[PDB]
């Protein structure tokens, strides 16, 4: 698959996020327990709550489509559908909103992804969401200064960075420490205090942000100079226009 046109670093980075054969760079280690705490849906050692009984207990009629489609493990179990949501700064965060939903539907099974300017979300079965979430948090989908895990109060994608280089967060879920240079997650994604903070590693420096970003900007690679990517957008416009007419 081709994924995206263009000849910039931005374009290649958009293709690499979509391509399940591209190995996302891992930047930080986070424990399973700490992913669970950051998600905030259940407590450590709490069994997965259910929304319906396990599939095997349900005795369904013959359906060739269902027989061909393997359910994700949380669907077999009857897990709740829960979410993880991220906000990406327009100051060169590595992932961005449509990059995420496009990538998620190429990489992940059984996924309900939503894109907005200030937040991007995936909803899926809870035990499967915890496995995807580890990857979204540990890899270059995430930077702990320019990306935020935020289930509510998401303002900041379009705000000026603070003096530490951190995105604004009304609820200050991610704190940079002036003396040490690491970010810690001090609250879960909905804003409740964590018993103990989670280290999220060092913010990527400017050079590495520029290497890895998927936003086009005049002070990075401008979209209007990625003339092949603009050509395909314009093509789509014109072909949809003619096809709606006749």
């Amino acid at each position: 698959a081709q994924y995206y046109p263009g000849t910039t670093k931005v374009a290649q980075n958009r293709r690499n996020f979509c391509n399940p054969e591209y190995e996302l760079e891992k930047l930080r280690e986070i424990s399973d327990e700490d992913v669970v705490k950051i998600l905030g849906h259940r407590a450590p050692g709490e069994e997965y709550p259910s929304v319906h009984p396990p599939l095997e207990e349900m005795d369904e009629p013959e359906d060739a489509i269902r027989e061909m489609v393997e359910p994700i493990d949380g669907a077999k179990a009857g897990d709740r559908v829960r979410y993880i949501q991220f906000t990406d700064s327009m100051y060169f965060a590595p992932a961005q909103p449509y990059v995420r939903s496009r990538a998620y539907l190429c990489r992940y099974r059984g996924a309900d992804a939503g894109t907005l300017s200030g937040r991007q979300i995936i909803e899926t079965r809870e035990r499967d969401l915890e496995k995807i979430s580890k990857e979204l948090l540990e890899t270059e989908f995430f930077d702990p200064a320019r990306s935020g895990v935020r289930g509510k109060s998401v303002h900041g994608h379009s705000l000026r960075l603070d003096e530490d280089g951190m995105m604004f967060d009304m609820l200050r879920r991610q704190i940079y420490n002036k003396d040490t240079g690491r970010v810690e997650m001090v609250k879960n994604q909905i804003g409740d205090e964590l018993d103990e903070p989670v280290d999220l590693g060092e913010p990527l420096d400017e050079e590495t942000l520029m290497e890895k970003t998927t936003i086009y900007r005049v002070d990075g690679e401008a979209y209007r100079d990625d003339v092949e990517a603009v050509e395909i957008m314009q093509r789509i416009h014109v072909l949809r226009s003619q096809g709606g007419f006749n």
Partner: protein, 442 residues
């Protein structure tokens, strides 16, 4: 034949039924089974005799929480169902050997009613079904028990609700898959105002059959709206065949190849490869490490992409066994395929746009709800001309129990009555048989 296209037709197990069927043998305008399905859905009513009896015994008539103290009437309607139904049938039929059907279900608690087709051939629309059924059962219940002139208006309220003070039959104990003509968003929309959950309930959650019934209703509405007249006719017929009738086993084979480990993106890659292999698209231009595809048949590219979209919904919401992500599949299948190819997505962007608002109105405070409460007449989901809602039907067929407003919650009366009807329950079977039958008349 106006069109030279032929398609191979399969059953819902992926076995070939008939090869090389002319496209127009699937047209709503020609296929006798689609005619019988559509006249069936015009003429079929579910009567809840238990619900009428209970509303009368408690005087709970006229809509939610409403009650008239002092108006209670205790009538043994379910215990006299056979007689009541026969007397209603005598008023419903036109003649004694016509196609009127009145059949008790549930030990007399429910009745399937099919009002004779001929009442509709001399009617403007379809409201004769609930209105002739309602009065025949109100009169039959009054005559069974000799209900007095002073009390009979309670029987009317228990059967048809607060109408005509309300525009709808508010509080009625009858139900139809269609809704009243005043609720159409535009003229020609009546076959679109059919809840997704009613389609999934009538077809017993068989995914292919739900997708077929939904497609047949949506694309038949496209004819009634004039959308499938002239320039656009072939586009609509090919969407019906490939997205809703599993033509050439395309949907089926995509799901088979992607069901075990697949994603929306893997289904896209397979569909693009199949379109290329079949000659539906070709490389037009090379950019820098990027092939720009073109087509000399936009209706067929649209159809192939539509089959892929249905497969992607089956793979994606089938793997989750949770319908909610159909709004995301409908969006990003189309958004990804345009940047994958350089060609326009299904319905030239209108599935993608329907999916943007459907996603918003299924995950926000402003309106909408869960997938099963939408329909082709809903303001959020009317915009694509038949290519979105059948995927929602497939997704709700595959939902394992994540919805509060599930077909069990919203459509139980519909399910008991309308799934009795073979052509509603298994339309893929009947439409393909009828197409094979008229194969040489096109």
């Amino acid at each position: 034949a106006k069109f030279e296209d032929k398609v191979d037709l399969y059953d819902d197990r992926g076995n070939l039924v008939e090869e090389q069927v002319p496209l127009e043998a699937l047209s709503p305008l020609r296929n006798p089974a689609i005619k019988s399905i559509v006249q069936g859905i015009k003429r079929t009513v579910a009567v809840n005799l238990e619900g009428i009896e209970n509303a009368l015994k408690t005087a709970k008539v006229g809509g939610p929480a409403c009650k008239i103290m002092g108006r209670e009437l205790d009538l043994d309607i379910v215990g006299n169902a056979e007689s009541i139904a026969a007397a209603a049938k005598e008023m419903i039929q036109v003649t004694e050997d016509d196609d009127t059907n009145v059949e008790l279900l549930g030990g007399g608690k429910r009745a399937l009613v099919q009002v004779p087709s001929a009442r509709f051939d001399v009617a403007a629309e379809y409201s004769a079904a609930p209105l002739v059924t309602a009065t025949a059962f109100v009169q039959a219940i009054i005559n069974e028990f000799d209900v007095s002139m002073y009390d009979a208006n309670m029987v009317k309220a228990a059967v048809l609700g607060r109408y005509p003070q309300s525009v709808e039959y508010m509080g009625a104990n009858i139900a139809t898959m269609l809704d009243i003509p005043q609720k159409l968003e535009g003229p020609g929309y009546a076959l679109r105002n059919i809840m997704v959950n009613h389609v999934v309930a009538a077809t017993l959650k068989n995914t292919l059959q739900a997708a077929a019934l939904s497609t047949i209703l949506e694309q038949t509405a496209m004819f009634e709206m004039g959308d499938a007249v002239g320039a656009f006719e072939r586009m609509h017929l090919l969407g019906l065949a490939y997205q809703g009738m599993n033509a050439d086993n395309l949907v089926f084979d995509l799901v088979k190849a992607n069901g075990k480990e697949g994603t929306v993106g893997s289904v896209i890659a397979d569909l693009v490869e199949r379109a290329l292999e079949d000659g539906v698209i070709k490389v037009e231009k090379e950019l820098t490490d990027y092939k720009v595809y073109g087509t000399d048949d936009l209706a067929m590219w649209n159809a192939y992409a539509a089959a892929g979209l249905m497969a992607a919904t089956m793979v994606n919401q089938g793997a989750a066994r949770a319908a909610q992500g159909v709004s995301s599949t409908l969006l990003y299948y189309n958004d990804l395929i345009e940047f994958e190819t350089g060609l326009p997505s299904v319905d030239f962007g209108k599935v993608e746009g329907t999916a943007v608002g459907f996603s918003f109105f299924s995950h926000s405070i402003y309106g909408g709800g869960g997938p099963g409460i939408f329909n082709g007449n809903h303001i959020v989901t009317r915009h694509s001309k038949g290519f979105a809602i059948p995927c929602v039907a497939a997704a709700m067929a595959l939902d394992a129990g994540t919805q509060m407003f599930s077909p069990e919650a919203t459509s139980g009366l519909i399910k008991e009555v309308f799934s009795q009807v073979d052509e509603f329950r298994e339309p893929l079977k009947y439409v393909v048989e009828a197409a094979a039958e008229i194969k040489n008349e096109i």
